[PDB]
Structure 1
Amino acid sequence: RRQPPEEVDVLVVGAGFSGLYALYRLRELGRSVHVIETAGDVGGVWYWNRYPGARCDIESIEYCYSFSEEVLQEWNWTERYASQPEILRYINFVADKFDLRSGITFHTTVTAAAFDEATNTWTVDTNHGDRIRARYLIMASGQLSVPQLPNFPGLKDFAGNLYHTGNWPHEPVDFSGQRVGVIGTGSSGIQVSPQIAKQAAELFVFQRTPHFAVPARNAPLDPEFLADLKKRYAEFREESRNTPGGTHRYQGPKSALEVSDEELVETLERYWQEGGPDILAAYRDILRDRDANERVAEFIRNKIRNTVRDPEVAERLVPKGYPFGTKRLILEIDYYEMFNRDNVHLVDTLSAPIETITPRGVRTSEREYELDSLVLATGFDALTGALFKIDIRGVGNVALKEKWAAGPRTYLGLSTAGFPNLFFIAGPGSPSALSNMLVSIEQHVEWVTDHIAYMFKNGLTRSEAVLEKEDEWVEHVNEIADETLYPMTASWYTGANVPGKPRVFMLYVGGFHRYRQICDEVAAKGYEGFVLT
């Protein structure tokens, strides 16, 4: 409805945390800037994922913007870990406060973008037949998207109520009196299930791969504490910027292998009772050493066995075969405890795979389960999923999809050679999903918008990563990743390992603070590694 400009200094794709701050900062810097967003309003993942139990896995006081002193002073977080409704209210507050929606076109999807060498501009097309000419294109298009896979066979035949965690109804769903099925036990499944368990007459959880999850220990945020923090919030967030992960997480000095079974249990139990993801850094080698990881993994496995009364059910819930904590750690709220309710039933689909969804419910090899409601608790596509849905064409009409088929090739994760004037916020090649994303998003938006400002200040119009420096960066990312357990997780690679072909690990794992220092050095040296004309 709001018409996008025909010409703009910067076009931003996406109106979540990334796109909104890019918009705001480019305005402040005196540039012309517009946003295109698929959704009807702001929020990004916090707009589109609205299933009950959706909640951030790092603390509220950390997972927030810091760019505005007034925002910091005026917003009251109510809980240790904020719910999606609260996060969405916060994002709407920011957009409201700074009149940001005047700079956004909603209900509109960018379908293609092509670089034009003559003018040093991007021409961008949308699914409403808009054409925009921007000098710079910022992809604030996110890291998590709906997977592009067919649904289970027979899904369209289900005769009951069907829900998707990825597109949950806007009005509340009452499961009272119902036999409900939940398919999927990743992040969405683990968060949504205990909420459904509160209402359903019966609940069947269809679990394929068991995932690691630790207790949130969520609690109301003491108003007195928050008021005290607000007096020194700038000092606090500068402390967060100077860490590997972008939060105040204690860095455990010891090796998980150097302690007695006794000290390990004592230490890991303290983390279990405190709750949250800080357990990931209980010891220094959890993500470096195969045996160090398995030791922490085993303790968690035993917590599952301890919590779930039925030992057969408990054993099916235990993650096996793969390392702990190589992805964002899921916080659970009575997910394990849930299985002790008489009305909750675990269906192990590794043992009995789903044959088909039926009109009555779900059929495995063993039996049919009759259900009144079925919830699909879907996972997420590769980090590159959003980008790959757009036909992006660079120098020589090369498709970004083709160049990145063996993995995302970038310099600092910020730009790729052959695709001038194009920038990625919080994406492959940078700390991204392996950090407090609000800290990474702010660093990236500041770096990219500062760079765009510098260009205009010096009368330049074309910014391209130097190919040698991209190759060095890619290799450097691989080298440091190969020193960790992260490569053990298939989702951090695009496609399988093929002899005699390159393979690029998705993310920088060397620590946010170290990455920040690199980026600052690059900027200080006049953008060393970019060719600017």
Structure 2
Amino acid sequence: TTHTVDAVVIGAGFGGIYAVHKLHHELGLTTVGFDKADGPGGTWYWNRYPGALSDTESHLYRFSFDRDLLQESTWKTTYITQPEILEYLEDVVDRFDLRRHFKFGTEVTSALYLDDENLWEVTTDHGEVYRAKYVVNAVGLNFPNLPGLDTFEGETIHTAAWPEGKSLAGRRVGVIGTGSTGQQVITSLAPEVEHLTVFVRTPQYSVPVGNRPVNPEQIAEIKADYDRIWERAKNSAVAFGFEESTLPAMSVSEEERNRIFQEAWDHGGGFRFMFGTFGDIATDEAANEAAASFIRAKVAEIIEDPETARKLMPKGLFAKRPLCDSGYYEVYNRPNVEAVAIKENPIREVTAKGVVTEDGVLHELDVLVFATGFDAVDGNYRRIEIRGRDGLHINDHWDGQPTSYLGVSTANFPNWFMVLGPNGPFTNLPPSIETQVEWISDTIGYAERNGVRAIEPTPEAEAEWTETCTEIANATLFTKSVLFYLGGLRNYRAVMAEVAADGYRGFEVKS
């Protein structure tokens, strides 16, 4: 059974929800949405592990496009939890009636271009087939081979498939992984579990998030100033709601530096620490080191036991998405929390009763939690039968690193777009999702008005875009993995407006 539509939107997180709203309400296109999830919410649908929390502040982790909605939504704390965000995204879907454009619990399994007809032939896992003029892919994004893993008699849980309402209260838990998800899950588990063992491979740099109850209504004061808030964020590099400093770290005294660091520490927020204090933490070695040493002193001060402190001490460049936490380091002071540094004491095997390390101790567990991420990020592209012009498979097109033109498109796949594809901005992401979806929507409307049959980037333009992302990246310390565009949102937005205004420079446009 075969349906013919104007647009397919794959995914129902922030990106897919807005794409469907744009393509249907603005453009008047027959548009169908899909998601494996049973509901909208995307990453916030799947991720229900304890202590799930935004690193963007509450008032800015949301859409900006609707003024009334912005005046309507509420929240409890300065930062927003998974249940609050998910119910927000459910409210967005209800607000604009997008529910009836979505097929939930429905996986897209093939998207094939039809060269002679100029259409995409897209099929689900219930064998329905959609013939579409445009595809918008807002698809978003790992089990450590551990010997004897399935010998384990307790529960094994990955962070990304946390069984609904499962509590670990009163259990013996092991946590493997100390990324953003690891730290949250660890801070949240420490108070409730009978015992907790963390297996840390790379300890990370992390600052206080400063997640505070919000004042009766000084939600009101932000709501009264929302147009300015969003205009500023749109006109900044990372759109996290503070002035991004230009002040070189090493051009003030030791005591001013410490003072400025301390005030960011106490206010909290990860990007604020990296980009709100000074302007060169990411591009100058001594500045980076200075921010690095500050955090390490914090760690040395907070963790009382010298040996525990040592295992948790972050080292090297403070040059990965700045982490922020709700008392992560302090957790290691509790008598039922234990850290194992697996670089120096590797995991030997898992057995019925728990994890055995190379020192030959059995860490008896009831539950093993993997906060170990997913294998790949481009996997929602690589796992689908996606074929563009001349039957060229996406995996063969991206025979190396995945590429894009402008973060939203790629050679050989006409009328096929990406929300947060490779080589795109690195930012508080909803305002970048909006930028991309707005532009993709503008583009699709343009094609409709102008009897365009196919639009796709040139290999030159795409390759020039990669060179552009690689130049900007090489100026930063984040080099020394995937290539973001690191010019910031303002720059990115100008790049996008310019391309559209200059009549889609870099794109081949068949009519």
Q: Counterpart in 2 of 1:34? A: 32
Q: Secondary structure at the match of 2:440?
A: helix
Distance 1:223 1:8, change over 3 A: farther
Whole-Å Cα distance in 1 between the matches of residues 8 and 389 of structure 2? 19
Provide Cα deviations, 1:355-414, integer angstroms capped at 9, x if missing partner.
Answer: 111110001101111112222212234432221111211112222222223222221111
Q: Give the stretch that moved more between structures: 55-64 or 395-404.
A: 395-404
Residue 71 (structure 2) aligns with: 73
1:298 counterpart (293, 296, 321): 293
Corresponding residue for 1:526? 503
Judge which range, 162-171 or 76-85, deviates more. 162-171
Alpha-carbon offset, residue 126 of structure 1: 2.4
**Correspondence for 1:128:** 126
Q: Which residue of 1 aligns with 2:213?
A: 220
Deviations 1:32-65 (A, max 9, x none): 1111101111101100010010000010111111
Using the TM superposition, name which of 36-45 and 69-78 deviates more: 69-78
Q: 2:11 aligns with which of 11, 14, 33?
A: 14
**Partner of 1:416 in structure 2?**
410
Alignment partner, residue 496 of structure 1:
none
Query: Mapping of 1:111-126 within 5 angstroms?
Result: 111-126=109-124
Rounded Cα–Cα distance in structure 1 between residues aligned with 2:396 and 2:297? 45
Question: Which residue of structure 2 lines up, in the alignment, with residue 502 of structure 1?
Answer: none
The answer to whether the aligner puts 1:509 opposite 2:486 as a matched pair is: yes
TM-superposed CA distance for 1:486, in Å, is 1.9
Superposition pairs of residues 393-412 of structure 1, within 5 angstroms: 393-412=387-406
The one-letter code matched in structure 1 to 2:126 is H
- Segment of structure 1 superposing worse, 250-259 or 275-284: 250-259
Which residue pairs with 1:267 in the alignment?
260
Question: 2:468 maps to which residue?
Answer: 476
Select between 40-49 and 121-130 the one with higher mean Cα deviation. 121-130
Is residue 95 of structure 1 aligned with residue 100 of structure 2?
no
Where does 1:50-65 land on structure 2 (aligned, <5 Å)?
Answer: 50-65=48-63
What do residues 130-159 of structure 1 show as CA deviations (whole Å, max 9, x unaligned)?
2211111111001x3xx3x55422221111
CA distance in 1, matches of 2:164, 2:249: 45
Counterpart check, 1:320 vs 2:315? yes
Deviation at residue 186 of structure 1 after TM alignment: 1.0
Query: Aligned pair 1:485/2:448, yes or no?
Result: no
Deviation, 1:441, is: 0.3
Q: Is the 8 A contact 1:241 1:247 kept in 2?
A: no
C-alpha change, 1:199 and 1:150, in structure 2 (3 Å) is closer
CA contact (8 A) 2:175 2:197 kept: yes
Q: Could you say which residue in structure 2 is the equivalent of 1:251?
A: 244
Task: Kindly indicate whether the alpha-carbon contact (under 8 Å) linking 1:187 and 1:379 is maintained by their aligned counterparts in 2.
Answer: no
> Could you tell which deviates more after superposition, 197-206 or 257-266?
257-266
Q: Which string of whole-angstrom CA distances, capped at 9 and with x for unpartnered residues, describes residues 190-217 of structure 1?
A: 0011221111121111111112211111
Equivalence for 2:151: 157
In structure 1, C-alpha distance between the alignment counterparts of 2:168 and 2:240, rounded to whole Å: 37
1:130-529 mapped onto 2 (5 Å cutoff): 130-142=128-140, 144=141, 147=142, 151-176=145-170, 178-277=171-270, 278-281=272-275, 282-321=277-316, 323-327=317-321, 329-366=322-359, 367-431=361-425, 434-488=426-480, 491-492=481-482, 506-529=483-506
Q: 2:83 aligns with which of 82, 85, 88?
A: 85
CA distance in 1, matches of 2:313, 2:362: 25
Residue identity opposite 2:492 in structure 1: Y
**3-state DSSP of counterpart to 1:339:** helix
Distance (Å, rounded) in 2 between the aligned partners of 1:392 and 1:485: 35
* 1:423-448 per-position Cα deviation (integer Å, ceiling 9, x unaligned): 010221210xx201001000000000
**Structure 2 CA distance, aligned partners of 1:263 and 1:227?**
34
- The answer to which of 68-77 and 298-307 deviates more is 68-77
**Letter of the structure 2 residue corresponding to residue 175 of structure 1:** A
Unaligned 5+ segments in structure 1 are: 493-505
How many Å separate the matches in 2 of 1:470 and 1:12? Answer: 23
- Residue type matched to 1:518 in 2? V
Superposition deviation, residue 241 in structure 1: 0.4
Give distance in 2, aligned partners of 1:409 and 1:162. Answer: 35
Note the alpha carbon deviations across 1:319-358, whole angstroms, 9 max, x for none: 223x21332x222111100011111111111111111111
Contact 1:37-1:106 within 8 A present in 2 as well: yes
CA distance in 2, matches of 1:272, 1:87: 25
Q: Distance in 2 between matches of 1:272 and 1:320?
A: 19
SS for the counterpart of 1:56 is strand
TM-score w.r.t. the length of structure 1 is 0.92
Q: Aligned partners of 1:386 and 1:50: how far apart in 2?
A: 20
Percent identity between matched residues is 43
CA contact (8 A) 2:319 2:477 kept: no
> What TM-score do the two structures reach when normalised by structure 2?
0.96
In terms of mean alpha carbon deviation, does 83-92 or 257-266 score higher?
Answer: 257-266
- Tell me which stretches of 4 or more aligned residues in structure 1 moved more than 4 Å: none
Q: Which residue identity does 2:491 align to in structure 1? A: R
Question: Pairwise CA RMSD of aligned residues?
Answer: 1.5
Q: Distance in 2 between matches of 1:377 and 1:384?
A: 19
Q: Are the equivalent residues in 2 in contact too, given 1:190–1:332 (CA < 8 A)?
A: yes
CA distance in 1 between partners of 2:421 and 2:77 (Å): 28
Unaligned runs of 5+ in 2: none
Q: Deviations over 1:55-85 (max 9, x none)?
A: 0001011111111122112110221110111
Instruction: Measure the CA separation in 2 of the matches of 1:162 and 1:175.
Output: 15
Q: Partner amino acid for 1:342?
A: P
Instruction: Please say if residues 214 and 331 of structure 1, whose CA atoms lie closer than 8 Å, have aligned partners that are also in contact.
Output: yes
Q: Distance in 1 between matches of 2:497 and 2:121?
A: 30
Is contact 2:38-2:104 (8 Å) kept? yes
| d(CA) in 1 for partners of 2:3, 2:153 | 47
Amino acid at match of 1:259: V
Native 8 Å contact 1:465 1:531 kept in 2: yes
- State the shift of 1:174 in Å: 4.2
Compared CA separation, residues 267 and 479, structure 1 to 2 (3 A): same
TM-superposed deviation, 1:520: 0.3
Deviations 1:454-495 (A, max 9, x none): 11011112111122211211111111111111222xx32xxx
Q: Does residue 48 of the first structure (1) align with residue 46 of the second (2)?
A: yes
CA contact (8 A) 2:115 2:390 kept: no
Deviations 1:269-294 (A, max 9, x none): 11111100201112111111233212
- State how far apart, in whole Å, the 2-side matches of 1:487 and 1:386 are: 25
Alignment partners' CA distance in 1, 2:506 and 2:499: 7
How many residues are paired up? 506
Cα distance between partner residues in 1 of 2:179 and 2:285: 23
Contact 2:236 2:244 in 1 (8 A): no
Distance 2:422 2:24 in 1: 26
**Contact residue 49 and residue 168 of structure 1 kept, 8 A:** yes
User: Deviations along 1:296-332, whole A, 9 cap, x unmatched?
Assistant: 11111111111000111101101223x21332x2221
